[PDB]
Amino acid sequence: MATTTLGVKLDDPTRERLKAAAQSIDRTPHWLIKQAIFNYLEKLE
Amino acid sequence: MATTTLGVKLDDPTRERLKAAAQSIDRTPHWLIKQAIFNYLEKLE
DSSP, rough: OOEEEEEEEEEHHHHHHHHHHHHHHTTHHHHHHHHHHHHHHHHHH | OEEEEEEEEEEHHHHHHHHHHHHTTOOHHHHHHHHHHHHHHHOOO
């Protein structure tokens, strides 16, 4: 989508967790990060 | 937590959605953004 690199609040271990999340969902950090926040929206929507 | 301002991928409308999400969950963007990504982790955990 129109996903741009914006400033977000993430903890170092949390950042790693996102990588792990990426690995858990078989997605690359770039894709995972995008979906982590957007899919977050998708989950609550 | 140890949430620091890191680079994340967010769309302009998505960014606004986070504000809306903040408003929907009665949290401030700073708090919402932190929880949006961390709570995202909480939801999938």
